[PDB]
């Protein structure tokens, strides 16, 4: 009939309507996650830059420990009792 | 006598110095690391949740083509040629 086609057609256009809203819903949601991510992506960055940093002093560190090891080690042989 | 045995110390002293300088500092980079593992941490969860109503949006939107899919087969058909 006229009015079976009319609210079919309007069946489908208020299903349309809920199709573009649950779509557009998720593409901001997409870009909302894009932020925090991209944020995080600088984040990373940050964290291997001082990953390096400390790769270093941990180097360092232990040379100077080396280093404090012979010089303790070399008083002791001139003090110790001989 | 103790010319000798009096500067390795002195050394010693100041290899306690840098030892002192390096530590401090492998610890300040150590908790500004932590402090972005923290915030990276924070927004991942966001992005975790994010997901899971992206998840259901997508079956949403999944419910609905296929609806309006239907709803097009029922109209092409009561407006076609038979």
Redesign the interface.
Known sequence: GSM??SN??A??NR??K??EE??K??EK??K??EK??K??GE??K??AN??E??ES??A??DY??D??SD??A??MQ??EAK
């Open positions: 079976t086609i079919m057609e069946d489908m299903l349309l809920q199709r649950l779509t819903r998720r949601l997409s909302r996650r925090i991510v944020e995080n984040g990373d940050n964290v001082i990953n940093e400390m002093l941990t360092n560190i100077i420990n280093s404090i010089c303790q070399n008083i001139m003090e």
